[PDB]
Design a binder for this molecule. Structure first.
Ligand SMILES: [Mg+2]
Ligand SMILES: [Zn+2]
Lengths: 61, 282, 59, 46, 182, 125, 174, 50
């Protein structure tokens, strides 16, 4: 007849060993994932323009 | 307060709508970036346009963690509250205790005489990041709901092949070191969503020499979780499994909190479709 | 469903399968009940009525 | 166990069929079309 | 003044006693009408603030693109405006240049916020209510009708207790609770 | 107008509406006089505000109480809170502030659940 | 009691009257012809009356076909040629190179009729007459005019081809 | 393209997009010339040709 679904996998010895060698290979490569903490002259006319825009900016704020 | 969260969700939805209608605009600006990068023919619509070629100075000056988590990814280590369904059962109590032990920054909540909206609002008032609610059948644990609280998302998984740690063996006690994570074979944007929710479910910022590993592998759309302790030998590094093992499987995903029942469904497992057996992740 | 099968282990031998109604809607047969003798339970993709009729294609 | 094996087989055969049909129709498409437009280029010139 | 006839019109093309070139469409008046504001000086001061913002965006444009000064400063200004309330979408710095309107600031004003939150019924009525003193911002009330309000006080605008307004409201819902003498 | 006032009282999941208006000195709770509340051991707990203050101040007014929802003890605490806040409101509206204040002091010194309720929201750590 | 929220009595532009740009503020259905069938045009019987245009005169002289005899050649019966005053003025405003074609098109066998309209858009004069009365036949060679009087029902169009004339819609040429 | 700053940069960007759109556009919407009343524009063009 016509079935409809993937039945829930019976976890077995060889599947566990596949998973084991996965984790162990990733151990001896030491590449495991995590969320590490988020951390944190030029020119005459350019310093002239930076100065002007910064003064104007402060006045505006 | 509650009003502040309400208009917060309003502004988030509006920014989503604008993001949708500005996707194509981002594409046209990227194309013009490439054209100025190398002089080429410019195609018909953007060539004929006047507003784009006028306003492309600020736009040239213009220019990844998901948005519901974006401000507090790796700064404030999350806090999770794990609670049981209703008039609990004793096997379920043991297993929920084991889940509380499995994660760090976790506290347990028996539930008798509560209601879902009062609980969720009380938890928001207290200030809590992430929530886990457990459902069982006849001792056997089978269903798990994860929520992220500032009107974040919820996921609902089923979970089947559970064994308690004590019923593996009367062994001893875990170390509760800030563990590590491995994520295998994840492909889709859904896959990125679930690795994102679980990564922000764990602790943030682990060490360099922490000695507890927690895996997450996709084996045919059945997320298999294990947990082992490892100690580094010279040639073959030995792993001792500890902590419960169970086969977990997604089935639905809401863009609201779990109390809503009518938020935006951003994924939902289709069952009675012609190709249900056929696809993976669908 | 009440009258498709005779025995519980017969139900379970057919368990986990695909079933459509004469209305034209899908569903799956899942598990056997206990107190009657041939009845099983199923889940469709929409609310069945009463006057419907369920069929199962087999070869 | 029977369920998993039968369904895996059916997916295999459907993939087989689709690949074979796409191959045949695409071969005949490009080659016979090259001939047809070669003759178009000639008959315009005839 | 006459609907003056054919030849005298074709002699007097360019005359107009009503709309001049310099009052550009009577823009100030039309916006003043749509949002019920009280002084020509209010309109023109909002014009000046808008103008200074646009000169800032223009010099920021004239800087070279990939300077972290330029990037960080423009992003900080976009934070300032998005928290201020004038511009809606934080991403298009084009919309910094092009969406900043005196209409947007004047709609961030107080009475438009009342018509937003459906406190009052229409905007003129909201101006009547704020002038009469029934509506408070957080812990104190407001009498200057031209209050600007950001998002973080849009969160706290509400009607004052023991006002006949709140009395009428909770009476219609049948929930006046006169221990608070609301 | 008729000098009148209205208040609410609330235990965990019940509601006690209390109208208070000038009258002939009576009580009515759900269309039945208040010698006939049910639980018969908490009838005194219902009586508590009257016996705290005195009786003449309830000799010169009219109460009308209607309660819905909840169970026994919840309704009872609801009625007592409603009667308390209603009496205080009537005194505040139509007679002297000093009488209102001495009423409030005697009440809250006795037991604060009369003037403010506690809807018990949990504390998660 | 002074009315709250008062405002300076400004000048609307969206409401007022003295602005010139603000100053600007029983059905009819033309019947189909009694002389027209579905597409037969029951009315026209010989003799015919034709309307000549500038393109027709041009290509006539460029292929050397005399007017009335060429018309009898095309139509196989008796027909009279008519030009309108607008068409005559069109040839005139074309001017000095085609004056010989003008001296030809002015011939007292061609009984000119007078029009009354401003402008000399001979296309407009023609098509207004032909949707007006449904009994002239129209000779020309303009492509757009050809398409338009093709779109109209029940009107025969007539142009040049090779060294003879041809007609398009007439159910009785032979 | 980094030490360029200001008006120079604005005119460069305009000319770049001008050519890059002119190679495939409709010439009107490519270079629409900006409006000016008739006698002042004719005086300008006279002085420039002079
Ligand atoms: Mg012409
Ligand atoms: Zn004419």
């Amino acid at each position: 007849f016509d079935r409809t679904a993937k039945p829930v996998p019976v976890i077995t010895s060889e599947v566990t060993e596949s998973l084991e060698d996965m984790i162990r290979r990733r151990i001896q490569d030491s590449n495991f994932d995590d969320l590490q903490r988020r951390t944190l002259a030029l020119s005459e006319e350019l310093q002239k323009a930076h100065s002007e825009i910064s003064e104007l900016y402060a006045n505006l704020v | 307060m509650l009003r502040r969260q309400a208009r917060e969700r309003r502004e988030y939805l509006y920014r989503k709508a604008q993001e949708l209608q500005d996707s194509q605009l981002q594409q046209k600006r990227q194309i013009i970036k490439q054209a100025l990068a190398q002089g080429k023919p410019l195609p018909k619509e953007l060539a004929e346009d006047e507003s784009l070629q006028k306003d492309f100075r600020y736009d040239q000056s213009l220019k990844q963690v998901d948005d519901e988590y974006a401000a507090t990814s790796g700064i404030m280590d999350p806090r999770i509250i794990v609670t049981t369904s209703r008039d609990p059962s004793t096997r379920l109590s043991q297993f929920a205790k084991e889940i509380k032990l499995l994660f760090p920054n976790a506290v347990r909540l028996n539930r008798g005489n509560y209601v879902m909206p009062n609980l969720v609002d009380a938890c928001k008032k207290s200030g809590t990041t992430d929530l886990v609610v457990l459902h069982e059948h006849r001792g056997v644990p089978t269903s798990l709901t994860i929520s992220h609280f500032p009107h974040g998302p919820t996921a609902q998984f089923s979970l089947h092949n559970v064994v308690m740690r004590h019923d593996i063996i009367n062994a001893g006690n875990q170390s509760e070191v800030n563990p590590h994570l491995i994520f295998d074979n994840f492909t889709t944007a859904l896959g990125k969503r679930v690795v994102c929710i679980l990564k922000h479910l764990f602790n943030a910022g682990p060490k360099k020499d922490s000695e507890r590993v927690i895996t997450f592998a996709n084996r045919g759309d059945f997320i298999s979780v294990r947990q082992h302790v490892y100690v580094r030998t010279r040639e073959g590094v030995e792993i001792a499994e500890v902590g419960p093992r169970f086969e977990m499987r997604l089935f639905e995903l809401r863009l609201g909190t779990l109390e809503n029942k009518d938020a935006d469904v951003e994924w939902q497992l289709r069952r009675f479709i012609r190709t249900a057996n056929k696809k993976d992740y669908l | 469903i009440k009258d498709m099968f005779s025995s519980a282990m017969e139900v379970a031998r057919f368990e986990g399968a695909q079933i459509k109604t004469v209305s034209g809607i899908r569903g799956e047969i899942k598990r056997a009940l206990s107190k009657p003798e041939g009845h099983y339970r199923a889940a469709f993709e929409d609310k069945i009525l009463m006057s419907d009729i369920v069929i199962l294609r087999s070869w | 166990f029977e369920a998993r094996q039968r369904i895996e087989e059916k997916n295999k055969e459907s993939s087989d069929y689709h690949a074979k049909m796409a191959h045949i129709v695409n071969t005949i498409n490009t080659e016979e079309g090259a001939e047809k437009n070669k003759y178009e280029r000639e008959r315009k010139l005839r | 003044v006459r609907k003056l006839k054919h030849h005298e019109q074709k002699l007097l093309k360019k005359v107009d006693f009503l709309e001049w070139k310099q009052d550009q469409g009577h823009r100030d008046t039309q916006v003043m009408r749509t949002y019920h504001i009280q002084n020509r000086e209010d309109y023109h001061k909002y014009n000046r603030i808008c103008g200074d913002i646009r000169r800032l965006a223009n010099k920021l444009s004239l800087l070279p693109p990939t300077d972290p000064f330029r990037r960080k400063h423009e992003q900080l200004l976009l934070d300032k405006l998005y928290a201020m309330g004038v511009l809606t979408t934080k991403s298009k710095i084009s919309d910094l240049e092009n969406k900043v309107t005196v209409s947007a600031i004047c709609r961030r004003r107080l009475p438009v916020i009342m018509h937003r939150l459906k406190m009052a019924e229409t905007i003129q009525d909201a101006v009547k209510f704020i002038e009469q003193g029934h509506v408070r911002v957080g812990p104190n009330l407001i009498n200057d009708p031209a209050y600007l309000v950001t998002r973080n006080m849009e969160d706290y605008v509400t009607w004052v207790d023991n006002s006949k307004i709140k009395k009428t409201l909770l009476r219609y819902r049948n929930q006046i609770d006169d221990f608070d003498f609301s | 107008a008729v000098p009148s006032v209205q208040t609410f009282g609330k235990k965990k999941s019940a509601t006690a509406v209390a109208h208070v208006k000038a009258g002939k000195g009576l009580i009515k709770v759900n269309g039945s006089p208040i010698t006939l509340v049910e639980p018969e051991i908490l009838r005194f707990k219902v009586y508590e505000p009257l016996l705290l203050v005195g009786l003449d101040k309830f000799s010169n007014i009219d109460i009308r109480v209607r309660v819905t929802g909840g169970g026994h003890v919840s309704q009872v605490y609801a009625i007592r809170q409603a009667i308390a806040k209603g009496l205080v409101a009537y005194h505040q509206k139509y007679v002297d502030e000093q009488s209102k204040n001495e009423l409030k002091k005697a009440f809250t010194s006795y037991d604060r659940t009369l003037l403010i309720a506690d809807s018990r929201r949990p504390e998660p750590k | 009691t002074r009315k709250f929220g008062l405002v300076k009595r400004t000048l609307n532009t969206k409401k007022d009257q003295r602005l010139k740009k603000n100053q600007e503020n029983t059905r009819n259905i033309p019947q189909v012809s009694s002389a027209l069938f579905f597409q037969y045009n029951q009315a026209i019987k010989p003799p015919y009356q034709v309307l000549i245009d500038t393109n027709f005169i041009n290509f006539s002289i460029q292929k050397k076909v005399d007017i009335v005899r060429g018309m009898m050649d095309c139509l196989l019966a008796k027909c009279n040629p008519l030009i309108t005053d607008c068409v005559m003025a069109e040839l005139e405003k074309l001017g000095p190179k085609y004056r010989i074609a003008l001296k030809l098109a002015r011939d007292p066998r061609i009984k000119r009729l007078s029009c009354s309209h401003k402008g000399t858009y001979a296309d407009d004069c023609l098509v207004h007459r032909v949707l007006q009365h449904k009994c002239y036949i129209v000779a020309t060679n303009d492509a757009g005019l050809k398409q338009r009087i093709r779109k109209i029902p029940g009107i025969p169009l007539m142009s040049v081809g090779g060294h003879a004339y041809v007609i398009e819609k007439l159910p009785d040429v032979f | 393209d980094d030490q360029v700053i200001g008006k120079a940069r604005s005119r460069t960007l305009e000319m770049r997009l001008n050519r890059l759109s002119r190679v495939n556009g409709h010439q009107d919407k490519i270079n629409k010339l900006e409006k000016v009343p008739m006698h002042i524009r004719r005086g300008m063009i006279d002085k420039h040709v002079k």
